[PDB]
Design a protein around this ligand. Structure first.
Ligand SMILES: *C(CO)[C@@H](O)[C@H](O)[C@H](O)COP(=O)(O)O
Ligand SMILES: *[C@H](CO)[C@@H](O)[C@H](O)[C@H](O)COP(=O)(O)O
Ligand SMILES: *[C@H](CO)[C@@H](O)[C@H](O)[C@H](O)COP(=O)(O)O
Ligand SMILES: *[C@H](CO)[C@@H](O)[C@H](O)[C@H](O)COP(=O)(O)O
Ligand SMILES: *[C@H](CO)[C@@H](O)[C@H](O)[C@H](O)COP(=O)(O)O
Ligand SMILES: *[C@H](CO)[C@@H](O)[C@H](O)[C@H](O)COP(=O)(O)O
Ligand SMILES: *[C@H](CO)[C@@H](O)[C@H](O)[C@H](O)COP(=O)(O)O
Ligand SMILES: *[C@H](CO)[C@@H](O)[C@H](O)[C@H](O)COP(=O)(O)O
Lengths: 220, 220, 220, 220, 220, 220, 220, 220
């Protein structure tokens, strides 16, 4: 499993990096914009927040294959262990092929369908990122798309991983993990919901009370 | 996975070959007819359009086993990396056996049933091409035929591949890929539908607007 | 896969042997009786019709184990490499054990149930032949029996094969192949229905018509 | 349930009318041809064989809608309780509509697909006859076609009945009956196999022996 | 639900009649033979053992339809309201038709298949008795037959009931009841296993012990 | 739905009767024993605790059918709205029939099997009480037994209800309710677990904090 | 597969050893009692009946772990290839552990639940014997218990085998074999029903008649 | 399989260690409190009760990661084969990563959801303990949680084991074992229910009675 946070919130990353076993951090253009910090400042700050390690993802902005290759090189120049996100379009697939030839690692992003995702893998992408919640929000079935995508990679491109993205609820992320995604990126709210529980907190309170009853303290 | 285009449109192949990871091109007599170019010109033109690589498929026209072997030899003489398509009939099965003994690679084509398809594999065909849409169009279940065929090859002839063909909609090609077909050939219209999406385009537009909003430009 | 014809029609075998990839021919007492030719004549003629190769099956007629062993020797003297069909009865099971010790290969035949079939394989039979249509015809479920038998051999006697037999329709044979039977014997009528199709013929006519339209012939 | 025999064998109908609860007899062009007896002789002979009752079916031979209507009138003039079989083609559908307007009851025949069958019912046919075995024989799934057809009539045309036809084994006819077909026509061989069983015969012998053992006779 | 015992043991019937809510008793020729008492004695004695009420079943012995009708009259003269069991054979089906016309109620017995059973109901039988254990014992699936039979009666002859018969274990009878059989006949051994349980007995002992503990008795 | 408490704890019944919509209280000999109060005092005390309404259940102790009828009469004399529990044994079934004829309402209790339970319904019991946890505890499947019992009553005795009993965990009682049990009796501990939740409590606390944050008070 | 007979009938073992491929014979206290022959006479007689080979099983009678160990030693002293059956109780489990330490092979018997059976395997038993029919008879589901037990051994104790026992019908034993039990012990009646069939016998008669029809004799 | 008891009852562990094949004992704060013995005395006492062997589990009480690590060291110092239980909270996850870095083996406890459980395994926990009954008791689906957790570990952290805990009924524990949990801890009541059975006790009595009948003693 590779566990990523999906954020441009450097302070949150520093805090959460000591809690979760993080592989690194993913960004997209909206997440970067939200943080109002440019990439050449953000990506080193994220690297530092992870404890000077981890893999980062950032997305090209150009709309031609040739421009996307240029963007990929610019992103790779910012920080070492960076994977370039390329939208799986006509021009994006062309760029993924060129980047495969050059040996720049890619992720095929903005995947709304299983076959589209598979094509990105076949073209050389190491990761494929379905937009689970976006498919859900637009009247589709995000989890079914992920099940189909994972099946396609397992059958037809086993070198590539699904990096499941776009979540509003833990249930979606859990469902992607159950479908066998080998990587995932969580927004901060969903990541924290996984490990915060009234039931768990209540169990701990009850243990403390029982221990106190017997021993007149709540510590070992 | 072997991804093929099902076409005689040389210019379109040249265009799409930089976008898709193509294994090559399949033809049939109707496809060749539509292009109005004899195989002895078409096949080298396709080879060039692919970037001087890839595997081509072309179909025999004779109605006897002996005549089909003669066709096969003529086809193999046009170009090196060529697989001969043989309709899976009485005479076609007989020809497939002869071509096995001769060492000419074959695809069993015009497959409308799973047992018919399996028989061509057992006779020596490296590929078996079910006509998915044709089964669908004539009141059958194309995908179920593909599932059954794939199961028969997996169980009984695992060195042979399904090369799924005959598509009107991406969903048909997806369902074939999900059934485990190790090769597929797409018409141009379906191929392009896989990689053109209003939802993906809208995602990209929204990324651009968010980026512009924060950084006052549309670029990295 | 081992594909057999279920016939005493020598000329039919010679004809079909150049079409199908045959493993050989099975006979039973009714099939032999229908052809009016005794075994010491038929079996050599079948061997010849196959091109001087392949595996033949013939059935004992005696009703005691000792009698069946004597029959097996007589059959093996006619065809040295022939597999002896023994009905899976009380005496038939005893004969199978005796033939295993003697090193004469057997098939357990007239199997109407899975457990009966498995018992013949445990006793030493290399093949087990359920009578699929006869189970169907008598108000059972022949395919369900085959599924159960195959599961028993897979679990409990994996060295033995199901040789599915007794067919009125291609669908029954197909379902047996889907159930994982590693061998099958087809009557002539079913075998030919597999490779005869109005849909396939119409596909070929359309191809010829399209080709002639463009090029004024149907020749490569 | 309406149980038919599918035959032109007048003597056999008379024999079986005593045994089965027959609704009548179906014919088609091939069945009529086999029996050697023209319809104007055959249809009265079948009526008498049934005990001067029951419903008969006979098929038009013309290839235009107008010609089929003329055939329909001729058939109805032969025999009172007669339903006209019309092949479900372009011209057949047109004829079914016309015959509906004229108040001549029809059956939509030569149905190889569910949608085709449903169309005949929507056009006015009181019965729809899938050719179960012919779908099975040509590498389809006849029973699946019947399940789909029945589902379509139940949902969309509940005044119309499936009259399941074309059988090589009792299992097919059973499966049709389980699918909910409210009418069926059996060939003589399949019909008789339903009611002839080694297991049944053996039970009755055992009853007779036990009864004799106790009471010294095999009678009440 | 109609619950029957399958027995010629008069004293057992008298005993069990105060335990079970019995609808009556079934017999067959072997069951009658086992008790060594002729019908003209047994059947009145059974009627008496039930408290002078309930429905009795007895089977014809003749092998022609006319003979079976004569037997039916003889049986009905012994018990005026008795249901006549007729084996579902060729002649048995003819007899059922004749008995329907004559207004003598019938059960179609020795049913080893669903279609055979349905045919007896269509011919006029008010009950159909599949031999569940005999189907099981001979390498079939007795419960599957019952499920199929019940489905056929529900779909095609809802006025007739399955009277499930032939049991070695309570589980078989339970499965028949779960399948929706509206009547059943139990051998004495199975019937008593239903209402005899080590677990139930232990529950009662515990209750008695707990009660005595608190109140020094086991009395209300 | 009829919701019962399974208890002799009068004070607890009084407490819970203002919280739950109770149909009444069930007892058994162990439950009565635990409370150390004879039925002639307990049953009127429960009636008062319920608010002077509801249906009570109490169990016979005798081991003969005659003795069980005597117990039943004694119980019915203690209080009006009372259903007599009878263990479903040989003598218990006999008693259930007698009590039907007398017009005393019964529940068939100590049910460890579906057929046993159905028999008590057929004999006249208005309720049938499977011991769910006891079946679970002794290596069976309590919920499956309840599903089967409910199916038997629905099919064969639809005027009788399942009264599900014997619970260690809410999940068991839920699964019984989901299987369609029209009545249930809960021990105090399970009853209360249904309506006590750390998650619900935390929701309420968070609502209070949000409300306070906005309005500077904790009240409407 | 290991096939056992479950019997103390020495003559029957000798008769059937010729027919079945027997691994040996199982006994229990009741089977031994029925046969009238003490173990020190019985076990050698069974060994001889098997042809001086095979594996025998016999059950301890003591109620303490220490006593069961003493019984185990006594049984092993009788006969070389002997596996000691220990009931899976509190004291039985303790004995299985001790016997494991001592290197005496055991079978955990009187298993009525999957978890109980798994515990015996974990404690050292090489075989676990569920009482299939006894679970069926007492209102459980014996086959479901076997499926669960087998699942537990496959997952958690794969060196241990299910030895399925206690059968009233062939269907139960078939279902156990389909569930994946690697050993089974059959009573004589069930064993013989597997290999005696009206349908099989009828097929052989038909073969004989056809053969006679063609060749004027019923012999090879 | 690793089988644990979930207890601080030293005498009970002594008694049951000779019965069950125990891998050791689990404790939690409430279980420790119930026994009123501090861990520095309890853990040696359990070690001895097991026979001077086995693996013990004990839980940290601190609420900060750094505090939990200090607890972990204290616990490890008490006894060698000691796995530290850490609640899977924000601070608990942090502590699990630190304890991984130090090489102190951990179990993630207080798991009420699958994703929470998986995160503890990714963080370095060798075991993950879902609180099955607590999920059941609070209106969730404990077994489904276990199924999902097991799936997540099999897919994503296969070096980690499920240690299923928190049980009120044998059925819960069985279902966890069927789900593939490689370790389990049972409370005393559930553990003993597995090997207490009225049906088993009755089988043994009948054996004893049969033996006595034949041989005039109840000894071997
Ligand atoms: C530790 C996990 O291995 C165990 O002691 C568990 O915490 C208990 O099994 C929890 O059960 P309850 O919460 O029902 O006491
Ligand atoms: C990169 C993919 O690996 C990630 O940052 C994802 O693109 C985002 O999570 C996508 O989220 P939305 O589609 O909801 O903006
Ligand atoms: C060869 C098979 O690999 C292809 O050219 C196929 O024949 C076509 O896909 C068939 O299309 P139609 O049968 O619909 O013309
Ligand atoms: C031998 C089995 O391998 C074959 O010849 C079979 O016996 C026959 O196919 C049996 O089927 P039919 O009895 O329907 O001919
Ligand atoms: C009328 C109902 O369609 C019948 O006579 C049927 O047409 C025949 O059963 C058709 O037989 P085939 O489809 O096997 O030729
Ligand atoms: C009549 C059917 O209602 C019954 O007496 C049945 O014929 C018997 O139960 C048949 O079963 P067996 O042949 O196993 O006794
Ligand atoms: C009567 C049934 O409605 C109740 O009192 C039940 O007998 C109890 O629920 C049974 O509990 P146990 O059998 O577990 O003591
Ligand atoms: C040993 C394996 O357990 C065998 O002898 C079996 O115990 C018997 O099959 C048990 O028979 P019942 O369970 O029907 O008494």
């Amino acid at each position: 499993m590779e566990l990523y946070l999906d954020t441009s919130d450097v302070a949150a990353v520093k805090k959460l990096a000591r809690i979760f076993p993080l592989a690194g951090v993913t960004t997209n253009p909206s997440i970067v914009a939200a943080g109002k910090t440019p990439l050449d400042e953000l990506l080193p700050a994220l690297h530092d927040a992870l404890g000077g390690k981890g893999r980062l993802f950032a997305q090209v902005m150009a709309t031609t294959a040739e421009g996307m290759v240029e963007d990929a090189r610019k992103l790779r120049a910012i920080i070492n262990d960076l994977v370039v996100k390329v939208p799986v379009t006509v021009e994006g697939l062309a760029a993924i092929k060129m980047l495969k030839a050059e040996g720049i690692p890619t992720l095929g992003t903005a995947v709304y369908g299983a076959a589209q995702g598979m094509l990105s893998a076949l073209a050389g992408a190491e990761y494929v990122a379905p937009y689970v919640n976006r498919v859900d929000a637009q009247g589709g079935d995000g989890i079914q798309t992920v099940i189909e995508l994972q099946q396609l990679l397992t059958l037809h491109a086993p070198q590539s991983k699904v990096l499941a993205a776009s979540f509003k609820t833990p249930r979606q992320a859990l469902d992607c993990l159950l479908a066998g995604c080998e990587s995932i990126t969580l927004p901060l709210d969903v990541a924290q919901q996984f490990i915060t529980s009234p039931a768990v907190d209540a169990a701990i309170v009850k243990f403390e009370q029982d221990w106190q009853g017997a021993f007149g303290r709540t510590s070992i």
